[PDB]
Design an enzyme around this catalytic site. Structure first.
Site, short mmCIF file in Angstrom:
data_model
loop_
_atom_site.label_atom_id
_atom_site.label_comp_id
_atom_site.label_asym_id
_atom_site.label_seq_id
_atom_site.Cartn_x
_atom_site.Cartn_y
_atom_site.Cartn_z
N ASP A 152 0.83 -1.20 0.00
CA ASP A 152 0.00 0.00 0.00
C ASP A 152 0.87 1.26 0.00
O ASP A 152 1.81 1.36 0.79
CB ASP A 152 -0.90 -0.06 1.25
CG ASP A 152 -1.97 1.00 1.26
OD1 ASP A 152 -3.03 0.82 0.60
OD2 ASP A 152 -1.73 2.01 1.94
N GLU A 156 1.66 -0.43 -5.09
CA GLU A 156 0.48 0.41 -5.35
C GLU A 156 0.90 1.88 -5.32
O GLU A 156 0.57 2.63 -4.40
CB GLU A 156 -0.64 0.14 -4.36
CG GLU A 156 -1.93 0.85 -4.76
CD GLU A 156 -2.46 1.83 -3.69
OE1 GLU A 156 -1.87 1.93 -2.59
OE2 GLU A 156 -3.49 2.49 -3.95
N1 LIG Z 1 -3.74 4.40 -2.07
C1 LIG Z 1 -4.19 3.54 -0.99
C2 LIG Z 1 -3.71 4.16 0.31
C3 LIG Z 1 -4.41 4.21 1.45
C4 LIG Z 1 -3.83 4.68 2.76
O1 LIG Z 1 -3.56 3.55 3.58
C5 LIG Z 1 -5.79 3.59 1.59
O2 LIG Z 1 -6.77 4.58 1.98
C6 LIG Z 1 -7.86 4.10 2.74
O3 LIG Z 1 -7.44 3.90 4.08
C7 LIG Z 1 -7.15 5.05 4.85
C8 LIG Z 1 -6.62 4.59 6.27
O4 LIG Z 1 -7.62 3.81 6.92
C9 LIG Z 1 -8.40 5.97 4.92
O5 LIG Z 1 -8.08 7.17 5.61
C10 LIG Z 1 -8.77 6.35 3.46
O6 LIG Z 1 -9.98 7.10 3.53
C11 LIG Z 1 -9.07 5.07 2.68
O7 LIG Z 1 -9.31 5.39 1.33
C12 LIG Z 1 -6.28 2.86 0.24
O8 LIG Z 1 -5.58 1.66 0.20
C13 LIG Z 1 -5.73 3.51 -1.03
O9 LIG Z 1 -6.29 4.81 -1.16
#
Ligand SMILES: N[C@H]1C=C(CO)[C@@H](O[C@H]2O[C@H](CO)[C@@H](O)[C@H](O)[C@H]2O)[C@H](O)[C@H]1O
Ligand SMILES: N[C@H]1C=C(CO)[C@@H](O[C@H]2O[C@H](CO)[C@@H](O)[C@H](O)[C@H]2O)[C@H](O)[C@H]1O
Lengths: 649, 649
Positions: free
Chosen positions: A380, A409
């Site tokens: 991530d 990612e």
């Molecule tokens: N690029 C990825 C990165 C992140 C950050 O880890 C992820 O974001 C999700 O998780 C966060 C932490 O719980 C929330 O704050 C966000 O709202 C939710 O979209 C997703 O994998 C993706 O966006």
């Protein structure tokens, strides 16, 4: 000591960071090795690629050809065998037989120095024969020698005897190479086939529960695996499976405060219940996870776990390793950000107070999941952690376990995307979702199938929980069909996020790429049985596409790809080849209007002559067609997104 | 250990052969060092170039800037000093002061986190002070620390105290760089100014004879030197000055049989009277040559001798060193060729029997002429001798005598032309004579002034004894005027071959680039005094152009060059800058018709805003113009071939 050798062989490719990092391949993958090769004067040169396996064992004779006239750029295709660290060189050499033949073909009819020309030819073919083993081939060449020397025959007869196909045949396998000059070796990291080729399906286990227990467990989510395997997928990517924080937990639709039953984002990892090496209690236990992994494996599915190096405020690390966070003067840790997005529910990691402790703990966590059968990690937002950190971590993991696959990612700027691939990420997310017109697709895939393929393997997710593109929002189901055909045929690795097959396309609001009522923040029960019975899912098309990939080697590789011109901007055509397998794809990018066009095939790039007709079968329907240089197509959205054809023998 | 450092510094340029050969510059020449630099997260990075001299001494603080938004490509201009082997690295770093100032400028006016943000700045400036050696500079930063922490003062004033010029001055001399990461050193070869900059004039001493003795001597040819120096040339290039063979000597107009008094080609070197280290008897003695060199030097002229590694059949090497040639089975040596051209009067040298003997003898010959004051060699047809042979010879000669300049006469394919420059040739002949339209000139000069300039220095001979271009044949004197302006202003090194200034333009035949009655095969007496009385020479324009170059540093460099759009295909416009000197050139490429055009200047590329004035003096006429962003020009062939303007300040 000179940098250039006797015969120049320069700028060998592929090359990554000037030779300091390995170029990439997988077992059974063919790719082009190229070089700039020339010599002083006007005599002919030849070249060949020497590919050496991890034990130093050379591959077959692999002669090279000039790729375009007057460029002095030469190339040949090589094929990687077993996994491990390989190396390759380019050898260049004077080609005296080609040189002599070209001069003899002129001078003999002109009657210039014909006695010298024929005797030079005789001595040259003797030199060639000295290296040929096998009495029959050597005898062939030596008979040409004697014919060249037979002054009782006309000069043209003596010459012709050195130019027979029988003689060409010996010289083809056993060429006479002068002044052989080698490039310095370049490294090649050959990995397992899944690094390049595979179909991916992402779903949230907690969403796959029961009427009486809405929050799924690993045991109830395991019941979703048969349908995923039945769609022909190879990899199941799960969001984080660990406990979820409560402090600053997000509510539904990315709201900042959760109610009492809200489940929060899985990426807000960690609580008193445990951290990255633990299971969310509502999913069950580690033994339940092992059950899930076992059932997956029995179905031919590999598990990819999300690895998100960050923490909720409740994660044990917050008090166990405070030095892994940046604290402001009042002690607060700013919540993570990826502007314009904000992640109020998590803290980002700081890497400069204790980089050794972080690397130790990271590979500990990875090796824990590895011990439970997880050999693929979806990383991530890797671009908010140091590039050199991933370089270290990946080298560590792959040093003991070279089969482990890491997927980056990184939706970010090109330099960071490319560098992350180059320091070891086996696969990369891409700009695929933002390439929707014919021009965008043609340009982006020309890049990815070109030099970038020496260091990057693309994973074409047609959607992700974060990316519902306007193309899908506005195009409905016919657009979902188009993007699935494109992803599955343009990259040997593609994926979808659950609900794609149901054509879920309601955005959070106009101009957003978020889903309304996103599954990241709420349980999302889906009536799979109803969608299947009512035919409101594209799971059959997805299944067929994965079956076509499994049956057609051309679709299990990346670098062999050619776009053929059509006369309608909305209709794209391309082909891919692997050995005798050729796949020809014609897609109508317009999801609302029927499009007719003429597809004018570049016959030679299909291995065909301009006047031939190619018998093709549309693997989507089983219909057969007879296609030549120019072919009328008519594609009606809803009825058919595309032709996905194999060329028949 | 990781390949990538803490703050990525990648793909530093310029680079030649992945760092195994040096990039090039000359004393006082500026050029851009660039790199790909970024970090994880969204805080600011900084970068700087560290240029080290042959003693390892670092140059000034040289901060880089991102060259275009979102590219992560950074650059800075460096300037080469004394000759020798230098090196450069790029350092990248976290920039905490920039990061904090950006945050504080947004937060403090909105009253957000004001105490916390001001305290972050206070302890940061305290961190910056820790490394400041001077007591008064430390007291300056601590003054800003104390103001930042002064809670009895308005928040805007607390912030403002951190942003004063007195503070900036301390930090420009001691910037706070975090996580400093360096590239590995790259090599730079700095050579004398003449390697890049100079005007060259080629003539045949034997043509400058008398009615009683038509074959000139060094003593008679020395009478040409005042005129050559008065035209403002710096280098006199002489064709070979050695004895000339008689066997297979060519006759007039490249005929195969010399008759009677025919002088032969000077490139057919060698007779029983001597070889490559000897003087042609009709030119005089070594002492006469010394006189010529001395008289040239008194006029500010350097001698370049032609070095042609080949033999007439009468050269002593033919029987002393038979292994320096390729022989056919009757022992005869085929004459040299360069298809479609044939050199029936010479044998080519063969390098694979005795490469050490050939290198030893070659550097012995070169050191012989070096001992007689020749520090420049024009190397004839280098591409028919091994690339690595020249690499070795040039490294040997420059190892003892780094001032010696080698010019490669390689009119061939691009790879060989580039490689010869890269392995050490100080200068290269170019495609200039075959670049005559605006598109041709713009594309080629964009190439030569771009990445090629890190390894090659062009010498723009507007003609040579082998190249009379159709542009000159059909255009007459207006065409000679245009090509002189172009060559003189587009390259810091240019040249003509004697007779160019007389607009000699009669070809051997339609469609040939040979001269009729070529001087390569016959004495060509020219009545220089009479041509000047009759005004049929463009020596005044040549003289003026060389003076303009000598007065305008912008014309003595290569890399800074910008093309400005005009609205007529036949009218080209470009500018060059060096420091505060700007030269703006507008040329009518049409030699037959007057051309009217509007020239639309890219004012920022001139250092100007779009509304400013461009007061210019046309150095060809002394006329003054008040130009702006859009200027009408009218150029009449035979009267005004071009405007060659300096921008007045
Ligand atoms: N690029 C990825 C990165 C992140 C950050 O880890 C992820 O974001 C999700 O998780 C966060 C932490 O719980 C929330 O704050 C966000 O709202 C939710 O979209 C997703 O994998 C993706 O966006
Ligand atoms: N590229 C250069 C190469 C050669 C070869 O040395 C020279 O050619 C001249 O010299 C030959 C040998 O005497 C004659 O055969 C040719 O007829 C005459 O043109 C010139 O310097 C230039 O063409």
């Amino acid at each position: 000591p000179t940098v250039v050798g006797r015969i120049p062989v320069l700028d060998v490719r592929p090359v990554v960071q000037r030779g300091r990092r390995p170029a990439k391949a997988v077992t059974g993958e063919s790719f082009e090795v190229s070089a700039t090769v020339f010599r002083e004067g006007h005599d002919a040169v030849g070249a060949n690629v020497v590919l050496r396996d991890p034990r130093g064992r050379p591959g077959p004779w692999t002669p090279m050809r000039e790729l375009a006239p007057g460029t002095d750029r030469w190339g040949a295709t090589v094929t990687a065998g077993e996994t491990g660290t390989w190396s390759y060189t380019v050898e260049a050499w004077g080609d005296p037989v080609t040189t002599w033949r070209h001069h003899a073909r002129i001078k003999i009819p002109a009657g210039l120095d014909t006695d010298l020309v024929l005797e030079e030819g005789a001595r040259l073919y003797e030199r060639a024969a000295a290296d040929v083993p096998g009495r029959e081939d050597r005898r062939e060449l030596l008979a040409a020698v004697d014919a060249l020397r037979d002054e009782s025959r006309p000069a043209a007869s003596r010459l012709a005897a050195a130019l027979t196909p029988q003689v060409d045949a010996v010289l083809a396998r056993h060429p006479l190479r002068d002044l052989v000059t080698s490039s310095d070796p370049l490294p090649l990291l050959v990995e397992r086939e899944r690094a390049l080729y595979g179909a991916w399906y992402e779903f949230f286990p907690r969403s796959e529960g029961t009427p009486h227990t809405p929050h799924g467990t690993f045991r109830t989510a395991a019941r979703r695996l048969p349908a995923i395997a039945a769609m022909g997928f190879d990899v199941v990517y799960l969001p984080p499976i660990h406990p979820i924080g409560t402090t600053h937990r997000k509510g539904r639709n990315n709201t900042l405060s959760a109610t009492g039953d809200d489940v929060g984002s899985p990426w807000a990892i960690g609580s008193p219940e445990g951290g990255h090496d633990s299971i969310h209690p509502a999913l069950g236990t580690l033994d339940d996870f092992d059950h899930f992994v076992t059932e997956a494996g029995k179905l031919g599915l590999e598990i990819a776990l999300d690895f998100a190096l960050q923490c909720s405020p409740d994660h044990p690390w917050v008090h166990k390793h405070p030095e892994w966070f940046h604290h402001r003067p009042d002690g607060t840790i700013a919540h993570a950000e990826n502007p314009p997005k904000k992640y109020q529910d998590i803290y980002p990691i700081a890497f400069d107070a204790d980089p050794d402790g972080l690397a130790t703990e990271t590979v500990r966590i990875l090796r824990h999941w590895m011990d439970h059968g997880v050999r693929i990690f979806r990383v991530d937002n890797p671009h908010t952690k140091p590039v050199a950190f991933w370089e270290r971590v990946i080298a560590d993991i792959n040093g003991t376990d070279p089969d482990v696959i890491f997927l980056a990612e990184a939706f970010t700027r090109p330099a960071m995307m490319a560098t992350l691939a180059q320091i070891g990420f086996q696969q990369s997310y891409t700009y695929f979702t933002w390439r929707n017109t014919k021009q965008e697709l043609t340009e982006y895939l020309t890049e990815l199938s070109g030099e970038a393929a020496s260091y990057m393997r693309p994973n074409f997710f047609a959607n992700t929980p974060d990316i519902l593109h306007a193309y899908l929002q506005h195009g409905g189901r016919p657009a979902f069909e188009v993007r699935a055909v494109l992803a599955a045929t343009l990259s040997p690795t593609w994926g979808i996020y659950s609900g794609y097959e149901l054509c879920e396309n309601t955005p959070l609001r106009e101009g957003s790429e978020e889903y309304l009522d996103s599954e990241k923040y709420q349980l999302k029960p889906r009536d799979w049985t109803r969608a299947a019975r009512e035919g409101t899912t594209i799971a059959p098309l997805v299944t067929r596409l994965n079956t076509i990939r499994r049956e057609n080697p051309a679709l299990r590789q990346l670098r062999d790809l050619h776009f053929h011109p059509t006369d309608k901007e909305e209709v794209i055509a391309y082909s891919k080849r692997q050995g005798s397998n050729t796949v020809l794809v014609v897609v109508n990018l317009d999801p609302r209007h029927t499009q007719e066009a003429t597809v004018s095939l570049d016959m030679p790039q299909l291995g065909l002559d301009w006047h031939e007709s190619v018998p093709v079968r549309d693997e989507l329907t089983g219909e057969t067609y007879h296609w030549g240089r120019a072919n009328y197509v008519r594609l009606e959205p809803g009825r058919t997104p595309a032709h996905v054809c194999t060329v028949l023998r």
